[PDB]
Write a protein that binds this DNA or RNA. Structure first.
Ligand SMILES: [Mg+2]
Ligand SMILES: [Mg+2]
Ligand SMILES: [Mg+2]
Ligand SMILES: [Mg+2]
Ligand SMILES: [Mg+2]
Ligand SMILES: [Mg+2]
Ligand SMILES: [Mg+2]
Ligand SMILES: [Mg+2]
Ligand SMILES: [Mg+2]
Ligand SMILES: [Mg+2]
Ligand SMILES: [Mg+2]
Ligand SMILES: [Mg+2]
Ligand SMILES: [Mg+2]
Ligand SMILES: [Mg+2]
Ligand SMILES: [Mg+2]
Ligand SMILES: [Mg+2]
Ligand SMILES: [Mg+2]
Ligand SMILES: [Mg+2]
Ligand SMILES: [Mg+2]
Ligand SMILES: [Mg+2]
Ligand SMILES: [Mg+2]
Ligand SMILES: [Mg+2]
Ligand SMILES: [Mg+2]
Ligand SMILES: [Mg+2]
Ligand SMILES: [Mg+2]
Ligand SMILES: [Mg+2]
Ligand SMILES: [Mg+2]
Ligand SMILES: [Mg+2]
Ligand SMILES: [Mg+2]
Ligand SMILES: [Mg+2]
Ligand SMILES: [Mg+2]
Ligand SMILES: [Mg+2]
Ligand SMILES: [Mg+2]
Ligand SMILES: [Mg+2]
Ligand SMILES: [Mg+2]
Ligand SMILES: [Mg+2]
Ligand SMILES: [Mg+2]
Ligand SMILES: [Mg+2]
Ligand SMILES: [Mg+2]
Ligand SMILES: [Mg+2]
Ligand SMILES: [Mg+2]
Ligand SMILES: [Mg+2]
Ligand SMILES: [Mg+2]
Ligand SMILES: [Mg+2]
Ligand SMILES: [Mg+2]
Ligand SMILES: [Mg+2]
Ligand SMILES: [Mg+2]
Ligand SMILES: [Mg+2]
Ligand SMILES: [Mg+2]
Ligand SMILES: [Mg+2]
Ligand SMILES: [Mg+2]
Ligand SMILES: [Mg+2]
Ligand SMILES: [Mg+2]
Ligand SMILES: [Mg+2]
Ligand SMILES: [Mg+2]
Ligand SMILES: [Mg+2]
Ligand SMILES: [Mg+2]
Ligand SMILES: [Zn+2]
Lengths: 157, 105, 68, 208
RNA sequence: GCCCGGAUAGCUCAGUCGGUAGAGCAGGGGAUUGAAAAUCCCCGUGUCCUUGGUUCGAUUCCGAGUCCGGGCACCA
RNA sequence: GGGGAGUUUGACUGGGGCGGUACACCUGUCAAACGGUAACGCAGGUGUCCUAAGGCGAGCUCAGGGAGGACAGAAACCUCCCGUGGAGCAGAAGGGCAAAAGCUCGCUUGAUCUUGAUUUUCAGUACGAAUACAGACCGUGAAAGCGGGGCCUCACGAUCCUUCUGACCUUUUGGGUUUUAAGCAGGAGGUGUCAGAAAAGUUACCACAGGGAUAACUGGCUUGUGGCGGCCAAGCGUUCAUAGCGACGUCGCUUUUUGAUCCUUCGAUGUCGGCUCUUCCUAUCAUUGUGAAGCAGAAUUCGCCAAGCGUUGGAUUGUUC
RNA sequence: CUGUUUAAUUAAAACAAAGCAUCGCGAAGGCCCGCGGCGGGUGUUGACGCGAUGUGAUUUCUGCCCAGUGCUCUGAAUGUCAAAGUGAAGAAAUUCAAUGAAGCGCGGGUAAACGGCGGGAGUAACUAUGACUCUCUUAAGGUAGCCAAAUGCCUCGUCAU
RNA sequence: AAAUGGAUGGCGCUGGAGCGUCGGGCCCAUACCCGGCCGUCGCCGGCCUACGCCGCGACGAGUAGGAGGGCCGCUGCGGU
RNA sequence: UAUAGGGGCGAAAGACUAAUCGAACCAUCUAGUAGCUGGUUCCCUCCGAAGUUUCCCUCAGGAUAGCUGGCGCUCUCGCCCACGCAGUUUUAUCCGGUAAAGCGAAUGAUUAGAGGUCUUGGGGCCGAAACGAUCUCAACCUAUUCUCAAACUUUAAAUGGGUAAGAAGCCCGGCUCGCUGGCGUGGAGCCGGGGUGGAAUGCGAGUGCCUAGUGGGCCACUUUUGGUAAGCAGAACUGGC
RNA sequence: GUCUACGGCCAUACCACCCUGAACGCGCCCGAUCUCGUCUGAUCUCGGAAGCUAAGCAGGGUCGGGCCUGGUUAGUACUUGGAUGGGAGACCGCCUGGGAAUACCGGGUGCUGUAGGCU
């Protein structure tokens, strides 16, 4: 009864946001998609051929197929009782890289360089990521001035 | 709608685009001594009345239009059928319109 | 004669009994659906790998063993 | 006219007189200012206003009765054009009526139960001003008595405040005369135009 | 309260085919008769109920109201 | 050819019927910032239209406004200037589009043949629609490319049977030739109850299995409607707001009106009114005791404590009234 | 009117009934029964008869419609028209054509056959009411009669008793 | 202001047995802890009915439903 | 004495036809049919639901998924660090258009004042009359002002959704390709070699078959649609019955 | 310190008005016989180079409008979770954590890549 066709909940989602109507900029096209990249999917209302669905907006998947001017993605979609890895064919205009994997590759390269320098000079560099520790026992300063006194203010309207 | 008379389209016999005569499909006069017709008369005879259901509730008032095509080249003569979408009003091949025209109604 | 038409209550608690796990994803993923031109490339690539990859790769294995 | 006890607390979403209603009758109130409409700014220094305490609806007929009562007490109290009253709150919500006996069971039950448009109410948030009366400095008791006599005629509980601001504008009455005397605030009818100094220089050259 | 059918000269009303405002009657003008009717020769008369969409164009095709008019409102 | 026979009489449903389609398929919203999410909810659409309103390329820019120019006037034509969508894109809306997806012009049939994969609905079945390719044969353009219908979201349909087309196709039963018939592959002929039965009415002479999943009678929640009150005070009341009333508004109470709902009973709670008879309430009609009056007396009116005790005889209608 | 009826809830205004009409049929017939035969019944009968209906004594009356729906008469009058028969093509199955019984449609009649019988606008020297006049309209537009009845919602219609 | 006579549960309760703020004690469920006993489950151990025997530890509700065990039971048949 | 069951007879009530008649009685087909009521017999142990999706002349029912149980199977444990997983958090990184807010930002409604002189029509006045001059009116525009929006929006939360957090990964070297092509170029595949210490916390996981019951729900916090409202009807998240 | 050609981000780079520009360069400009296309050599196409930076263009300015960013707005509006918290209800206060927007005020107003050329 919700008129189950394609693209029905999308008065806002496939819209080009604001002061960005018009032609697509070409840096979206001129990018390199190899098998094994990790891509975000974001709807573009200007190119109406290969929009994915309203389901896969914002989902982040793996690339496995490359054609002339589109790309095939595998995306984990949740349905009723289980999640499934589906296979979508999306044009290039809806796609961008996730910066998360590139940040992780920078982590891996820093870890390899620290590992080589550590095996070189015998240092134990602790190249894991430690979460935010509690504050160490620091030592505050109150020179010159007594601390400012605060009190709750009287009500007015 | 409106289709042209000649229309260069692929015909599967000689593997190329060839020009085609485009005519209206006729349903064709249905025949006695087919399999289902002989079975229908064999089951219709005897005291049984109407065995198989006849149809009443016709709702689609439009019929799909299919076209007979012929390769105009001699000794090829390959015919095949092709479908269009539904239409209520149909003309075969005349009266293409102009845009520089005054109506005069 | 009226009944409750549609609901989604008590559904998440059914779904998380056995658990909403992932779809396994083993090594060497299924290769159907990929570009037929690329697939026609890769099949002749594989069989000519297995054809001509004996002699020069054996030479290079001997060379890298002699180096190290 | 259904009793206003039921058309009360803001339950349903706001439903404005718009493209989709198309059949709502006219609101009860039509004019909103009663006193000296063409009063200039320094002609009335203070203003007292009426703050709502509850979150509720107010009906257009109730606003109609209240502005008439306040108007009558003002013109009996401090004379004609000794006040400028403004109902700051306008009705735009449209309430619905699903009326019956349209006396027997046999018309319909609750089957088609999207009601016809009854009339117009005004939605109120807590701390929103209903009325504002700007008067002289001598008329302080008359404003309090007038808004007291309107307090009984609105529903619910709401209080009466005497503003710190000069006029109907948003500027302080203490800073006001000290700051209009030289530089910034040019009077504009009943309103006051603020000037920044980040304009073209033609404004400052047209001044002074 | 639903559900259908309407609105056009002053009055009855058609014309709808999206491009025409038409008959009859009344009113007005002559002639005819000493004079009236009747007759003969002519006239004028409309927002095609109102507010909006499509169209190249809405009197008409639709949407919404106004004022009417039919029908249903049953078992207990 | 209802003389006789057999069978049918859709489904949803704030009971059923009548009304409507919420019975297929789309748009915005309800939708609670992923998707999903209901009601006979809202506001609407569709069962089409197009040889171009498809494809490509080129040129150009719209609505509207201002300023001017014979006849020219509010609206005819021309020219200049401003003009970020205020226009147009066939249609219901939403999205998108400005050397363009709009307007004009030139070519044209990619609206062609064929295998698959995937999305959408989803059981992860289908039809439909769509995405990305692959291989032919082409159109266009200088070329890059674009194109396998409509700028996108709706525009449509199984088995069986008929019908037409395709191969120097197969089988046509002991072997041949020919006709015919059957078959493979893909198009149409319809199933709008739209994943598809071929279908009228009545029962008060009714029957049967059941349901309180489901109405009529009471009871219960609710109080619009009905009835009974309270606050504010514009006025009426010769003058005079409140002796008595009181609009414009406003807050309640009552279950003696009617309505809403279906919680209880459908293996039965005997259904209206009257006759008789007992008890209770007070929101007091009269009596006892009082206060106030626009209370001179009388007769009235309005309050308070107060249900002890009274509240009748008849014509009509079955009546409550 | 007498009569009769739902035995075991109705006694009637129901039913019949005489009277009044209407229709078929001259026996190779009407109307029926029957599984069957020229088998039965009416019929041991013959239009003052048999068969099938409507209305319901007498008295006075029986209006208007053949459009619908029936019923009936008529003519191969001419369209539609099934088997069989004829003719043609074909090796044959088959196919095509012509000719064309009933009926249907075309035409006539019938309402004591079923049934049906309008609404507006103006108009008379006090006002009302309106005989008259114009228009749309159906096949015909309720005539003689009669009434808030056993038929009238509004309704406890209005007046008199 | 409502119909039978009745409901802070009642009796009652006013330097509280009411209202609000709190304190110190105190009461107790199959909850928790400790200890015993039964069974299920798991992890074993022994060359003592190996289908038995002990050991360890965690746990035990339950309709529709499903399995396992019964040296539970009724009637008959071969063996003992 | 005649008439016998879809038959008889009826001064017509659907009455009578052996106490039965709107289709008699007896036997057989017959243990007919039923998505519909009622019952459905020994103990203990263990595990333990659903009233939801889709389709059906389906809406009291079934098939299908989901939930459950049984039967197992394949691995993991025991003797400076593991495999895999998670209704969780962190660290990064994307996504959204609701609460809120906004109108002196588009659209839609909407209150009031001030300023200005183009445009008229309309009032007044100087006047034979004259855009001859003047006053006024409306409209218009300019900056302001009050209030709004489920089918408006520049902005924009909290809660939330996806992905990543390493050996299936790095790095080096070489072979093959009919795909691509200035290029031994790109991209894939194949081979050989080299170094596992890569957030927090908790846990044993993976997998196959068979299939019962279920397909009438209700309530509570909070968010919410219709209604005046309900112990009303209808939804969302979580828990309970 | 600049421009040209091709660009990337797509207003910090637009719009309005006023200044300045030496060298190359872009232009403006002078003409239709061929290629070309129009009603029209105005636009498009083609052979140049007498002039000119007047305009575009390039730099700067405007207590400029807009944009971006940062304060104030404001720990306010809201909000995950919780309470035998208050309240007749409407809603409100608290613990736990997270946390916004306009008027108001201040600052800026292109950065770059490849190839080429002038000082
Ligand atoms: Mg036969
Ligand atoms: Mg259900
Ligand atoms: Mg009331
Ligand atoms: Mg009508
Ligand atoms: Mg008229
Ligand atoms: Mg029958
Ligand atoms: Mg039904
Ligand atoms: Mg959502
Ligand atoms: Mg959500
Ligand atoms: Mg311009
Ligand atoms: Mg649009
Ligand atoms: Mg173009
Ligand atoms: Mg191709
Ligand atoms: Mg044979
Ligand atoms: Mg033979
Ligand atoms: Mg269906
Ligand atoms: Mg029947
Ligand atoms: Mg009877
Ligand atoms: Mg019930
Ligand atoms: Mg009941
Ligand atoms: Mg009982
Ligand atoms: Mg009883
Ligand atoms: Mg009893
Ligand atoms: Mg008494
Ligand atoms: Mg008798
Ligand atoms: Mg009797
Ligand atoms: Mg005879
Ligand atoms: Mg008689
Ligand atoms: Mg007669
Ligand atoms: Mg005739
Ligand atoms: Mg024949
Ligand atoms: Mg004749
Ligand atoms: Mg008269
Ligand atoms: Mg008469
Ligand atoms: Mg007490
Ligand atoms: Mg147990
Ligand atoms: Mg029988
Ligand atoms: Mg008997
Ligand atoms: Mg049985
Ligand atoms: Mg039986
Ligand atoms: Mg069902
Ligand atoms: Mg299991
Ligand atoms: Mg939304
Ligand atoms: Mg809001
Ligand atoms: Mg079972
Ligand atoms: Mg199952
Ligand atoms: Mg059930
Ligand atoms: Mg809260
Ligand atoms: Mg509920
Ligand atoms: Mg219910
Ligand atoms: Mg020339
Ligand atoms: Mg030329
Ligand atoms: Mg020139
Ligand atoms: Mg220049
Ligand atoms: Mg210059
Ligand atoms: Mg600025
Ligand atoms: Mg600048
Ligand atoms: Zn051919």
């Amino acid at each position: 009864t919700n008129t189950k066709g394609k693209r029905r909940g999308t008065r806002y989602m496939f819209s080009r946001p604001f002061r960005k109507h018009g032609v697509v900029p070409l840096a979206t096209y001129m990018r390199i998609y190899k098998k094994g990249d990790i891509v975000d999917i974001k709807g573009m209302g200007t190119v109406q051929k290969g929009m994915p669905h309203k389901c896969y907006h914002g989902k982040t998947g793996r690339v496995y197929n490359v054609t002339q001017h589109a790309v095939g993605i595998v995306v984990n979609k949740q349905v009723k009782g289980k999640i499934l890895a589906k296979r979508i064919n999306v044009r290039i205009e809806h796609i961008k890289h996730s910066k998360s994997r590139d940040s992780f590759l920078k982590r891996v390269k820093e870890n390899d360089q620290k590992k080589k320098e550590a095996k070189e000079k015998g240092t134990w560099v602790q190249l894991k990521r430690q979460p935010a520790p509690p504050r160490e026992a620091h030592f505050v300063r109150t020179n010159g001035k007594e601390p400012e006194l605060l009190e709750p203010i009287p009500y007015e309207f | 709608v409106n289709v042209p008379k000649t229309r260069r389209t692929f015909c599967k016999k000689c593997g190329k685009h060839q020009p085609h005569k485009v005519t209206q499909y006729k349903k064709g006069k249905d025949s006695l001594y087919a399999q289902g017709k002989r079975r229908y008369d064999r089951k219709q005879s005897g005291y049984g009345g109407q065995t198989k259901p006849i149809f009443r509730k016709k709702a689609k008032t439009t019929k799909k239009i299919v076209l007979r095509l012929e390769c105009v080249e001699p000794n090829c003569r390959s015919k095949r059928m092709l479908a269009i979408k539904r239409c209520k009003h149909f003309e075969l091949g005349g009266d293409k319109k102009r845009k520089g025209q005054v109506i005069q109604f | 004669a009226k009944s409750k038409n549609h609901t989604t209550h008590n559904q998440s608690r059914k779904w998380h009994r056995n658990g909403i796990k992932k779809p396994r994803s083993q090594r060497y993923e299924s290769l159907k659906g990929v570009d037929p031109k690329f697939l026609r490339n890769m099949r002749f690539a594989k069989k000519h790998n297995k054809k001509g990859l004996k002699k020069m790769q054996a030479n290079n294995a001997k060379a890298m063993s002699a180096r190290a | 006219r259904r009793p206003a006890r039921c058309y009360r607390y803001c339950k349903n979403k706001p439903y404005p007189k718009s493209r989709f209603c198309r059949g709502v009758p006219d609101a009860k109130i039509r004019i909103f200012d009663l006193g000296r409409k063409k009063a200039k700014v320094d002609e009335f220094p203070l203003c007292g206003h009426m703050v709502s305490d509850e979150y509720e609806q107010l009906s257009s007929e109730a606003l109609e009765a209240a502005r008439i009562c306040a108007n009558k007490y003002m013109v009996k109290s401090c004379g004609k054009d000794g006040f400028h009253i403004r109902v700051r709150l306008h009705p735009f919500h449209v309430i619905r009526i699903n009326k019956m006996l349209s006396a027997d069971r046999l018309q319909t039950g609750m089957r088609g139960a999207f009601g016809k448009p009854q009339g117009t109410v005004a939605r109120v948030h807590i701390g929103q001003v209903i009325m504002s009366i700007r008067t002289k400095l001598q008329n302080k008791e008359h404003v309090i008595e007038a808004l007291r006599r309107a307090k009984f005629k609105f529903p619910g509980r709401q209080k009466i405040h005497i503003s710190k601001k000069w006029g109907f504008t948003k500027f302080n009455a203490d800073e006001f005369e000290d700051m209009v005397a030289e530089k910034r605030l040019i009077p504009d009818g009943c309103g006051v135009k603020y000037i920044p100094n980040r304009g073209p220089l033609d404004k400052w050259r047209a001044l002074h």
